[PDB]
Design a binder for this molecule. Structure first.
Ligand SMILES: [Co+2]
Lengths: 203, 228
């Protein structure tokens, strides 16, 4: 939104860059931060940990009734079966979408998300607009922002992750996918479908 | 604290800004900001709850429109100063130095295998906040409870929109680090954790969706029994 008091994005970026490089120089001299540490954290979340991991969990649940039960019973333990877990995903509780219920996740108090299965969240998920509105007008928000229309009669459960427990949505399996392989099914699972702002891809 | 950051239910923040696609890190400074998390954590600048409290104390206007990772930088500085690990004056001088010399080098330093070890361990092993306590859970599934109307001036996870509201316990997750103490440098003091369900009508009155409910996590002290 317009704010006549705000500097240009270019000026904002130039100031932040200098402030961060300055702080970085100090932490480096203190011996608690190094360039290899920086590069390692970045490579992990730019190429290793992402929503493709959550997709693997979803497709296994879609094709393994027993795994699905275990997943809904104890998310952290189930995902460990696939070597999936870790930082900010130490405690996961998966919730299943059905014809009677739709789940949507948010962190109104900040921006928490289960990185081990979704990777670092897109900026809109961490911003004030989505966080403030989703717990108050979830149906309208889903329609207006994501073009996702949830029938009035269908209940919308909004999960506000205020603790370290991380909620992840197990989207319903799209129709027309009988007998599909886990690899083929994975193409339908999106980060958005596991947040609940969109259903898995149709067709 | 009753900070602006507690946005759940706030009106007028505007439409969502969502590009078709975006990189994990939009600029090099963001990668640095991100990596400083495990770095300062290992260095004892702060714990996770304190980390959040530092961001909560930001200038509201700055918080609402600044890049997300800038919030991280503010909390690092906040705790660096609090713990006396960061000299604000030196930081200001260096900031000006890098403003005038953006391509100037960073200080010479030796790489440290233990820092990489820390990163891999934290990422793949995680930093579990679950803890064991001697007391049994006070509540159970099905209990009807009321969320406290307390308004701590320090850190807490008591969204203003659920205070004084009545809901039903959905699940007991065991005990975890307690924000109200941890975020204020008072220790983990673990408390049992529960997910509680609140109908939209209870939260928003008539303006609430007739067929929606919000699930919010509550540490034991946050709720008191209404009906078993
Ligand atoms: Co958060």
């Amino acid at each position: 939104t317009e704010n006549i008091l705000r500097k240009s994005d270019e000026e904002i970026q130039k100031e932040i860059t200098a402030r961060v490089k300055a702080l970085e120089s100090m932490l480096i001299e203190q011996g608690i931060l190094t360039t290899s540490m920086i590069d390692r954290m970045a490579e992990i979340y730019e190429n290793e940990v992402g929503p493709h991991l959550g997709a693997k969990v979803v497709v296994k649940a879609w094709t393994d009734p027993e795994f699905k039960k275990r997943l809904l019973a104890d998310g952290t333990e189930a995902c460990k079966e696939l070597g999936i877990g870790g930082l900010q995903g130490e405690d996961m509780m998966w919730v299943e979408n059905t014809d009677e219920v739709h789940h949507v996740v948010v962190c109104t108090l900040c921006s928490c998300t289960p990185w081990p299965v979704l990777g670092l969240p897109p900026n809109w998920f961490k911003e004030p607009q989505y966080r403030s509105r989703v717990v108050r007008e979830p149906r309208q928000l889903l329609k207006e922002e994501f073009g996702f229309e949830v029938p009035p009669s269908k209940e919308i459960k909004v999960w506000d992750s205020s603790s370290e427990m991380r909620f992840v949505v197990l989207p319903q399996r799209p129709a027309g996918t009988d007998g599909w392989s886990e690899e083929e099914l994975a193409t339908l699972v999106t980060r958005e479908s596991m947040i609940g702002v969109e259903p898995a891809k149709a067709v | 604290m009753n900070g602006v950051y507690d946005v759940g239910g706030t009106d007028g923040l505007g439409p969502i800004n969502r590009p078709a696609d975006e990189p994990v890190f939009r600029a090099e400074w963001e990668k640095v900001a991100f990596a400083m998390f495990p770095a300062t954590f290992r260095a004892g600048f702060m714990g996770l709850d304190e980390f959040r409290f530092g961001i909560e104390q930001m200038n509201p206007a700055e918080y609402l429109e600044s890049p997300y990772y800038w919030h991280w930088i503010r909390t690092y500085i906040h705790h660096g100063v609090r713990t006396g690990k960061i000299d604000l004056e030196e930081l200001e001088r260096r900031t000006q130095y890098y403003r005038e010399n953006p391509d100037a080098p960073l200080p010479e330093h030796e790489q440290k295998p233990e820092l990489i070890e820390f990163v891999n361990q934290a990422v793949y092993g995680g930093l579990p906040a679950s803890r064991e306590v001697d007391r049994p859970p006070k509540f159970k599934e099905g209990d009807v409870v009321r969320f406290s109307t307390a308004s701590p001036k320090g850190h807490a996870r008591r969204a203003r929109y659920v205070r004084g509201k009545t809901g039903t316990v959905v699940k007991h997750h065991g005990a975890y680090i307690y924000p109200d103490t941890a975020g204020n440098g008072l220790g983990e003091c673990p408390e049992h954790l529960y997910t509680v369900r609140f109908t939209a009508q209870e939260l928003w009155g008539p303006e609430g969706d007739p067929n929606s409910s919000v699930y919010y996590d509550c540490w034991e002290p946050y709720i008191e029994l209404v009906d078993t």
